[PDB]
Amino acid sequence: FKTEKEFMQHARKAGLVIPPEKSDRSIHLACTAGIFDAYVPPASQVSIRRIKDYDANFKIKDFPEKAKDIFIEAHLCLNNSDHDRLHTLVTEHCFPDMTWDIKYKTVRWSFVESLEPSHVVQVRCNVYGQITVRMHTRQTLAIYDRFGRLMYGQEDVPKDVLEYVVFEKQLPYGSWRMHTKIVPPWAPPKQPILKTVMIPGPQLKPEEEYE
Amino acid sequence: ISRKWEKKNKIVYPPQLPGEPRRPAEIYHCRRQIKYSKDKMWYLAKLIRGMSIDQALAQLEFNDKKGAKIIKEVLLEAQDMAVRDHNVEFRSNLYIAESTSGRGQCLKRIRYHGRGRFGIMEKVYCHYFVKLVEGPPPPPEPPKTAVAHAKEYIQQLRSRTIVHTL
Amino acid sequence: SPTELTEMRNDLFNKEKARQLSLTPRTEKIEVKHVGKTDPGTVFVMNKNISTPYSCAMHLSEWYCRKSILALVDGQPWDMYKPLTKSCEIKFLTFKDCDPGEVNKAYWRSCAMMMGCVIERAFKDEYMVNLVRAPEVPVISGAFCYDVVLDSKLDEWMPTKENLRSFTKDAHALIYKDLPFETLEVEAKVALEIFQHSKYKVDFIEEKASQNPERIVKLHRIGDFIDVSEGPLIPRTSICFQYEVSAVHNLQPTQPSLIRRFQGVSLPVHLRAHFTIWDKLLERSRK
Amino acid sequence: TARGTPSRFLASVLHNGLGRYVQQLQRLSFSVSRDGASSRGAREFVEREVIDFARRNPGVVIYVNSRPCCVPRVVAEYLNGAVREESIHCKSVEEISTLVQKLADQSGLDVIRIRKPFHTDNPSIQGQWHPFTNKPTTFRGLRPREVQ
Amino acid sequence: SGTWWDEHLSEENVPFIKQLVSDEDKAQLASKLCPLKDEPWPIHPWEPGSFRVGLIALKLGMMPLWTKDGQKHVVTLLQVQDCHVLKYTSKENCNGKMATLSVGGKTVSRFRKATSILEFYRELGLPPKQTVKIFNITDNAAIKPGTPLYAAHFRPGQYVDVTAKTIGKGFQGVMKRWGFKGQPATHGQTKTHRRPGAVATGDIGRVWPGTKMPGKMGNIYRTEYGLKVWRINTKHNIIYVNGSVPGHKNCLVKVKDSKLPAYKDLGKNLPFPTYFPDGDEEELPEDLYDENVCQPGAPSITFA
Amino acid sequence: ISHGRVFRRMGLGPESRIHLLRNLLTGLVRHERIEAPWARVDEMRGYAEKLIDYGKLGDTNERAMRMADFWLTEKDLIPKLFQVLAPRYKDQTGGYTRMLQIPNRSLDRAKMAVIEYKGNCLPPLPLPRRDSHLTLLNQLLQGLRQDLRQSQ
Amino acid sequence: AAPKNRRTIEVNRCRRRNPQKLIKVKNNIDVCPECGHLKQKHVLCAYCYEKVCKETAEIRRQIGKQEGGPFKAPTIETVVLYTGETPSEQDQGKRIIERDRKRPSWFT
RNA sequence: ACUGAACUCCUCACACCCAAUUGGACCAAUCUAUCACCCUAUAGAAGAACUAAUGUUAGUAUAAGUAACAUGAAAACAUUCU
Ligand SMILES: [Mg+2]
Ligand SMILES: [Mg+2]
Ligand SMILES: [Mg+2]
Ligand SMILES: [Mg+2]
Ligand SMILES: [Mg+2]
Ligand SMILES: [Mg+2]
Ligand SMILES: [Mg+2]
Ligand SMILES: [Mg+2]
Ligand SMILES: [Mg+2]
Ligand SMILES: [Mg+2]
Ligand SMILES: [Mg+2]
Ligand SMILES: [Mg+2]
Ligand SMILES: [Mg+2]
Ligand SMILES: [Mg+2]
Ligand SMILES: [Zn+2]
């Protein structure tokens, strides 16, 4: 099937009366479905007290240096695929969005030193504190195949990336982790890939014509 | 049961050195439990076993057999996989390196014969395995010429020794 | 020596071919749309000056690599092995089309260029062979033409039937190599550097350079042999199936030197003719 | 059998007898259990005669490992890189003392079938027979039924 | 990719090529009709022991013919269609007991022959032929390759051997092929009516070679011997051979003089190398006849 | 041995091969384009062009009315025969149908075919066109035609 | 008669693998110029025939509406007109099947 | 005169070519006793060893892709025709 509607419309039509049953145990999440208030990149000190009310030892000045070590150690675990180490530095909204496309291919991401010091932009808040931090760093990329042939980016030349990495913290044992990465609409286009792509048009039945 | 052909698409080679020729892509694909026999599939699998993938889809569109309609569904899904998942840029730059057919788990029914006797009818199933290698197909081996037969005969005369002596 | 004239010219062709690739802006992506009756509205997001129309045909099928011969980039005929330049629209042109006008002409120039590679390398080294041009004669005339000037020793020289069969056996030897036509659009200043040793080809470069509002002249190369031409060409030399240098005609108004025209007739692998139809295209190609 | 098993020619390693005779063992390696009846004779070989053996040929370097094994092995490594690992499991002291002296005397070449019982490298001195030995020469090289 | 001549031609070039090569079909055949105005090989008189050329004729069909005894004879019409002499090999090259001419008849589309065959007829200057038969011959009878042979090469009263492939009857059973009696119909006889019986005996545990079994009947070369030529027809080049000739209608047969020992000296009054109509001496009538045959136009016969 | 035997044997007898072509020809007059197996089409095709010759014998011919009464099992197509089809082909003397090859039947892999009456109201079949006249082999042969026209 | 012995796979391979039993490679396959799908020579294109066979299936569905029941074959010649078309001079006295779609590029 | 064995000699080594039957020396694997501890030792025991019973049961071959089996026709798949 494709959707949840098309399953229930086929489970009704097949006679599959499946009972919606009640259970005492619920799915205990530790993330959110994206960002609370979507920051749009070109006053929120209420949300820094609501973070300090549960944590009670947290400085907004220290955190961009903490934000780099969350960002850098998350991206070095892509070079080895240490999935037990990504799960403590990256929330489960961000872990399928940085590992599912890179399975069965090797990446050789490497961090060289930044250009601008990181600084927090906004802060928002069974309660999830959320911190957006701006990153103007200098990175390299080299993504390969199964067969080891280069498919994206050269290995030596460092590039300039502008990043707004939203962070999140569940508020008893969770820490600050990467949650998502804001890509603005005015961002310059990414580096062109090394191979050429074909895009098929409509697959036409003999009765259908091309208009 | 074993499913080792599905796992061959997950081998990750180390990233290549620039002082090394480019490794061609390999795309292992299979369909299991085809309601067709494993030795009627061999004539279709032997036919396409060296061809490029566009010549293979041509010679299977016009075969009258049942399995040619099924191999053409396998070769099209493995060609769509090679540009999607295994990083081949050209659809046309593939050829069939291996094309075999194993037997599958077959069912058993009862065929009644002419008296109290009977027979055990077996409902045949089969597998079909393919590997596409990225590249132009290699040229077929020509017959060895009269020069090459004469070299092998003279090399067989040149190699003989005085046997059972010093 | 024509040994040292071949090593000198191909290094400057390679120097200009390497120069054009060096101006490529690190795989900039162009987007060409396929216009045609078959397979409509597909795009090929391709590299800027590395991608050719053969790479466009390689995405669709093997049938567009074998059957298709030219390329109608923006309504203009292009080689299949000439690098693209900008976002455009491509048709692929076949020998068996309803109007194969430019396909006939591009095949007509190519067997003229394939002939000139035979003429320079058939005479032994003590004889002087000099190419002039390839006249754009029509297909209805029955033979593609190539004007050559030989040395003064060979003024009362006319080849026999067994000499032209040694021309064709060197023209089928060029087909068996399956050599691709290395095309490259060169400016007029480099073209006079490659063709400095041949005064007949210097002035031909001057014809095409002022015909053109810029100084660009088409250069082509079969293998280790460079020649000018007027327009596009064929992808490979394996396209010529039937080939025969039919006759040699000495032109009539030749007071300074013999403008000696060569005649040949050819057909593709696509458009083969029967032995009795081809033999009648040989007795008409001797005029 | 001989059509099943590989075969080789009778050779030496580096012309082992021409200049000098080089002892072809490098190492012996004994695994010998401290508690175990299978290495009862192997413990008496180490106690009695491995010190008399390690002085009789000082080119062989002998390693007694003494680990808890069920089967005591002897791992003879030779000069051409070959390894012949054999067991001394439940052998008396007189049966290991000949098994080890057999390992010292032999070279590292395989114990597959040797084709010829000899090896001459210059087999001919007066020149090997071809059809034109023992055939007299005619005058002027005239073959039969040739007039001139 | 296999091609043919008609594949890449347009509808303006299809009827043009058809009329063109059929004009060179009739140009090359009409430029051979005077072989004596060319350079012929020398004309020798007949001697005892000399053998001459035969013919290749299309079998047209049969019709009755009557002699003056009033006895019906059946007679097979053999039309000589475009028969020529193709090549000559001496006895040194043949390594047989005689020399050979090669003779071909009944012109065929050039578009449907192999390339190696199409050049043999291009050096000869003829359209290609369907059957090419080889006639043993002496050194006297040696015609230049490229001369036509007509029906007046034979004369009435002469006996003639005719060779062609028989009518192919496919896989035939052992009753039609070998004339076996089969088994009776009733009185039992369950599954035997047309079956071969015992094949061999019991002691020999095998079947002898050359045992008559079911197989492919017909379609082999058979030769009839001693067939009289009753009349010839010089206008349409018809031989009127006595009796029945092997082969169906419109098949090409191989007509030559008889090898029978009773008809071995009977070439004294025959046109020896072949009939040359360029010779013109006593030009032959419309029909030549044997002395016994009642010609159509003679009065009704009477045995007084 | 079936030398010279020009009729296919079909059905379950010589009667049933006429009743098989009769339903195939009744569908051809009604629809003017029929898919059928290729051996059943080209066996019908002799009867499909011999029938229009019997419609051109006229409506009022009793010998032609008896033949249309047999060969059309739906009696409404006998007005369509004598008043539509036989007036449509009153110029030409033959070749009323065109028979092509279709890709084989998906059920039993049978060699299929389509006949149609020429010049009907139906959409045209994708007919096999000859090679174009501007191709290289046709222009080299057009140059030879115009030269040999100047040989006179 | 029963087999006296068992045929081996060495004997069975040389029977069921020689080129008399193998699938012959066919060389008929061209490309259709009209649609680019690949067809054989001597056979109509499978794609381009299904263009016609699904356009004829709609025309025959409207012929069946204007007749009404069986045995209504008219003695009047037929003309298929698509949308925005006028019956010309030769279509006077002809049966007109008014179709709904646009006149296709291959119909004429 | 030469050829010619498993006879006899030669170099080394020797318990190391009969059916039924009989005597003897060893032993795989298992469990138990006690050891042993990458797979063993000495003993005690026993459902203690399978190239063969038209053996039993399961798998899979061969015969074999063989014998055999099936859908009246066209079509708008409404219908009509045989
Ligand atoms: Mg079975
Ligand atoms: Mg009888
Ligand atoms: Mg009976
Ligand atoms: Mg009975
Ligand atoms: Mg039947
Ligand atoms: Mg002896
Ligand atoms: Mg003894
Ligand atoms: Mg024990
Ligand atoms: Mg037991
Ligand atoms: Mg067993
Ligand atoms: Mg048993
Ligand atoms: Mg089988
Ligand atoms: Mg059988
Ligand atoms: Mg059967
Ligand atoms: Zn089509």
Swiss-Prot record, chain A:
Assembly information from the UniProt record: Component of the mitochondrial large ribosomal subunit (mt-LSU). Mature mammalian 55S mitochondrial ribosomes consist of a small (28S) and a large (39S) subunit. The 28S small subunit contains a 12S ribosomal RNA (12S mt-rRNA) and 30 different proteins. The 39S large subunit contains a 16S rRNA (16S mt-rRNA), a copy of mitochondrial valine transfer RNA (mt-tRNA(Val)), which plays an integral structural role, and 52 different proteins.
GO biological process, one term: mitochondrial translation
Presence of the UniProt keyword Protein transport in the record: no
Its biological purpose: Component of the mitochondrial large ribosomal subunit (mt-LSU). Within the mitochondrial ribosomes, required to direct the nascent polypeptide toward the tunnel exit and position the exit at a distance from the membrane surface.
Any single Gene Ontology cellular-component annotation: mitochondrial large ribosomal subunit
Protein's recorded name: Large ribosomal subunit protein mL45
GO molecular function annotations of the record: RNA binding; structural constituent of ribosome
Compartment(s) of residence: Mitochondrion
Family, per entry: Belongs to the mitochondrion-specific ribosomal protein mL45 family.
Record keywords: Mitochondrion, Ribonucleoprotein, Ribosomal protein, Transit peptide
Curated annotation (Swiss-Prot), chain C:
Keyword terms of this UniProt record: Acetylation, Leigh syndrome, Mitochondrion, Primary mitochondrial disease, Ribonucleoprotein, Ribosomal protein
Domain TGS: 28-94
Entry's Gene Ontology BP terms: mitochondrial translation
Residues found modified as N6-acetyllysine: K91
GO cellular component: mitochondrial inner membrane; mitochondrial large ribosomal subunit; mitochondrial ribosome; mitochondrion
Gene Ontology molecular function terms on file: nucleotide binding; RNA binding
Subcellular localization, as worded in the UniProt entry: Mitochondrion
Tissues where this protein is expressed: Isoform 1 is ubiquitously expressed. Isoform 2 is heart-specific.
Highest taxon in the source lineage: Eukaryota
Family: Belongs to the mitochondrion-specific ribosomal protein mL39 family.
Subunit structure: Component of the mitochondrial large ribosomal subunit (mt-LSU). Mature mammalian 55S mitochondrial ribosomes consist of a small (28S) and a large (39S) subunit. The 28S small subunit contains a 12S ribosomal RNA (12S mt-rRNA) and 30 different proteins. The 39S large subunit contains a 16S rRNA (16S mt-rRNA), a copy of mitochondrial valine transfer RNA (mt-tRNA(Val)), which plays an integral structural role, and 52 different proteins.
Protein known as: Large ribosomal subunit protein mL39
Taxonomic lineage: Eukaryota, Metazoa, Chordata, Craniata, Vertebrata
Name of encoding gene: MRPL39
Residue window of the full protein shown: 36 to 322 of 338
Swiss-Prot record, chain D:
Tissues of expression: High relative levels in skeletal muscle and testis. Lower levels of expression in the heart, brain, placenta, lung, liver, kidney, pancreas, spleen, thymus, prostate, ovary, small intestine, colon and leukocytes. Expression is coregulated with TWNK.
UniProt record, GO biological process: mitochondrial translation; translation
Keyword Manganese: no
Taxonomy, superkingdom: Eukaryota
Localization (cell): Mitochondrion
Entry's Gene Ontology molecular function annotations: RNA binding; structural constituent of ribosome
GO cellular component: mitochondrial inner membrane; mitochondrial large ribosomal subunit; mitochondrial ribosome; mitochondrion
Annotated family: Belongs to the mitochondrion-specific ribosomal protein mL43 family.
Oligomeric form and interacting partners: Component of the mitochondrial large ribosomal subunit (mt-LSU). Mature mammalian 55S mitochondrial ribosomes consist of a small (28S) and a large (39S) subunit. The 28S small subunit contains a 12S ribosomal RNA (12S mt-rRNA) and 30 different proteins. The 39S large subunit contains a 16S rRNA (16S mt-rRNA), a copy of mitochondrial valine transfer RNA (mt-tRNA(Val)), which plays an integral structural role, and 52 different proteins.
Protein name, entry field: Large ribosomal subunit protein mL43
Organism lineage string: Eukaryota, Metazoa, Chordata, Craniata, Vertebrata
From-to range in the entire protein, with total length: 2 to 149 of 215
Curated annotation (Swiss-Prot), chain G:
Residues where Zn(2+) binds: C32, C35, C45, C48
Keyword Transit peptide carried by entry: yes
A single GO BP: translation
One Gene Ontology term of the molecular function aspect: RNA binding
Keyword Transit peptide: yes
UniProt function note: Component of the mitochondrial large ribosomal subunit (mt-LSU). The mitochondrial ribosome (mitoribosome) is a large ribonucleoprotein complex responsible for the synthesis of proteins inside mitochondria.
Subunit structure: Component of the mitochondrial large ribosomal subunit (mt-LSU). Mature mammalian 55S mitochondrial ribosomes consist of a small (28S) and a large (39S) subunit. The 28S small subunit contains a 12S ribosomal RNA (12S mt-rRNA) and 30 different proteins. The 39S large subunit contains a 16S rRNA (16S mt-rRNA), a copy of mitochondrial valine transfer RNA (mt-tRNA(Val)), which plays an integral structural role, and 52 different proteins. bL32m has a zinc binding site.
Listed GO CC annotations: mitochondrial inner membrane; mitochondrial large ribosomal subunit; mitochondrial matrix; mitochondrial ribosome; mitochondrion
Family note: Belongs to the bacterial ribosomal protein bL32 family.
Organism: Homo sapiens (Human)
Name by which UniProt lists this protein: Large ribosomal subunit protein bL32m
Coverage span on the entire protein: 79 to 186 of 188
Disordered, as annotated region: 86-108
Compartment(s): Mitochondrion
Positions with biased composition (Basic and acidic residues): 91-103
Keyword list, A-Z: Mitochondrion, Ribonucleoprotein, Ribosomal protein, Transit peptide
